[PDB]
Design a binder for this molecule. Structure first.
Ligand SMILES: [Zn+2]
Ligand SMILES: [Zn+2]
Lengths: 403, 137
């Protein structure tokens, strides 16, 4: 196999407690020439967890930060980061199938459960993500008294939650105090799961492009390229894939997507090109398709698989609605009024984003017509977002049922 | 040390904490490392702030660095170009040492040490206590 990322660690917590700084500090050195995704504004940053041969400590660096000797490759992982309390919330509920663990960054200099910190623990709780590590950050700002008081708070906050058995590591994302302990804990907690590679392949296309540029060579200059997260099985150079919703056609009915098929020419994972790609990190598939079809991220939201073995495409959707008890916001925004027949909601499933029209009401279940077909497996969770002014606020989530 | 013993994790979480902030005598104005690893070069563009906060020279630090590290950098309009890839913490770890052996008085802790030259020998030192440690280490 490859030395590509083996697991996805979501970086969650208050937008300011330090998640963003810690990610950059750990990933900066494995950067080549993040995002906002197009559907979800999620970003993927890889980082090679290494062990210093001489002093025995862990880091995310080639050369031991301390003694200075060469460190050894132990594993490669990929953190999922995203400025924006909501966007991360959305991505989690929607694509919970992407994370394998999460690092909850809580600032020690602030009362423990901040309105935003609760929502995350809330989302992690809803998607059953139990492989969590807690990083009490900014220990360089609270004397040992306040620190122990924060710790206890954190302890009272996590009891009876999925992060009930998560360590609480005091760290300085700014000075890197105990980053060696943290990085090591990612190996202790959050190990690469046992995944059967033989299961049919499924990849959620996060982005689609046209790497072409009047660079002008007419030969075998690349075709359409898709980037996504393999979540099941594996893709291999030379594979014949079937893309999901597909390419639109001309008004027989009004708008119709036909599923298209292509052949994989390349696969990037980890910074290099490989002949086989696996879950963990982002994968760049090279196809024999017309770049004119992937240009501008038009393929974004689609799913890829082996011709025949894929999810069902939908054109309508009934869901098992579960509104959320949110705390971050202003009272108006807060007490969500229930969805109404005829409202136009914002839906997020996998990496697909589409508007839906409520055309039915029941007891904690609703119906919706899709603005754009979305390839999804039933029982999969869908993020439901209502507007509220000029913005789009996450009010709850639904459960795909059959119509 | 197990991750479940927060206490030990806390003291170990303060000893890496710089001098100026760690203990009693706190020069406290040292703002942390800002690192940008572009292409195949590391650049700490907050450099001047560090040096000017430490009241040490600009090039007296570029050096302590390329020494503890093995790359080459040049200084410019308050920034610094390093020739390889270096995580913010690798650099964050060296600046920590500098402050320890080139900016503080080991007898009476004081950001007020200053570099003196009394013979071809560099002895730099405290304006508060008067200790004149030989610093070339
Ligand atoms: Zn070492
Ligand atoms: Zn002194």
């Amino acid at each position: 196999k490859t030395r590509q990322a083996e697991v996805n660690i979501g970086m969650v917590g208050h937008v300011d407690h330090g998640k963003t700084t810690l990610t950059k500090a750990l990933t900066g050195v494995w950067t080549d020439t993040l995002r906002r995704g197009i559907t979800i504004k999620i970003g993927f940053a890889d980082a090679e967890i290494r062990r210093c041969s001489n002093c025995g400590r862990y880091s995310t660096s080639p050369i031991c930060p301390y003694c200075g000797h060469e460190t050894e490759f132990i594993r490669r992982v990929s953190f999922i980061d995203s400025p924006g309390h909501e966007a991360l919330m959305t991505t989690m509920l929607a694509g919970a199938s992407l994370m394998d663990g999460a690092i909850l960054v809580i600032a020690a200099n602030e009362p423990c459960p901040r309105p935003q910190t609760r929502e995350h623990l809330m989302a992690l709780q809803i998607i059953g993500q139990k492989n969590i590590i807690i990083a009490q950050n900014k220990i360089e700002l609270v004397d040992k008294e306040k620190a122990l008081e924060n710790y206890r708070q954190i302890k009272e906050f996590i009891k009876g939650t999925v992060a009930e058995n998560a360590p609480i590591i005091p760290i300085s994302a700014l000075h890197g105090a105990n980053i060696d302990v943290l990085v090591k804990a990612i190996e202790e907690f959050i190990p690469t799961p046992k995944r059967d590679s033989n299961k049919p392949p499924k990849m959620l296309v996060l982005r689609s492009f046209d790497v072409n540029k009047p660079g002008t060579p007419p030969e075998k200059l690349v075709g359409g390229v898709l980037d996504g997260s393999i979540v099941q099985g594996k893709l291999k150079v030379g594979d014949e894939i079937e893309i999901r919703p597909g390419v639109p056609y001309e008004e027989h009915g009004r708008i119709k997507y036909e599923p298209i098929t292509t052949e994989i020419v390349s696969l990037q994972a980890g910074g290099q090109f490989v002949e086989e790609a696996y879950p963990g990190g982002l994968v760049g598939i090279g196809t024999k398709l017309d770049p004119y079809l992937t240009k501008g991220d038009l393929m974004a939201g689609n799913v890829v698989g082996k011709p025949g073995k894929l999810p069902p495409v939908w054109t309508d959707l009934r869901l098992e609605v579960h509104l959320l008890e949110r705390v971050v916001g202003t009272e108006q925004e807060l007490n969500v009024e229930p969805i109404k027949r005829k409202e136009v909601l914002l839906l997020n499933v996998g990496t697909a984003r589409t508007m839906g029209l409520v055309t039915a009401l029941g007891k904690d279940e609703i119906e919706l017509k899709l603005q754009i077909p979305v390839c999804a497996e039933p029982g999969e969770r869908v993020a439901i977002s209502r507007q509220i002014g000029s913005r789009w606020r996450l009010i709850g989530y639904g459960i795909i049922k059959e119509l | 040390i197990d991750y479940y013993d927060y206490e030990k994790l806390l003291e170990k979480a303060y000893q890496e904490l710089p001098e100026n902030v760690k203990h009693h005598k706190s020069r406290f104005e040292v703002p942390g490392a800002l690192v940008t690893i572009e292409g195949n070069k590391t650049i700490i563009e907050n450099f001047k702030d560090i040096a000017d906060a430490l009241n040490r020279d600009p090039q007296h630090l570029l050096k302590f660095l390329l020494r503890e590290i093995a790359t080459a950098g040049t200084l410019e309009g308050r920034r610094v170009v390093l020739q390889g890839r270096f995580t913010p913490y690798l650099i964050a770890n060296k600046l920590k040492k500098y402050i320890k052996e080139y900016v503080i008085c080991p007898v009476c802790g004081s950001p007020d040490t200053k570099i003196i030259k009394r013979d071809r020998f560099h002895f730099l030192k405290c304006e508060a206590c008067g200790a004149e440690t030989p610093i070339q280490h």
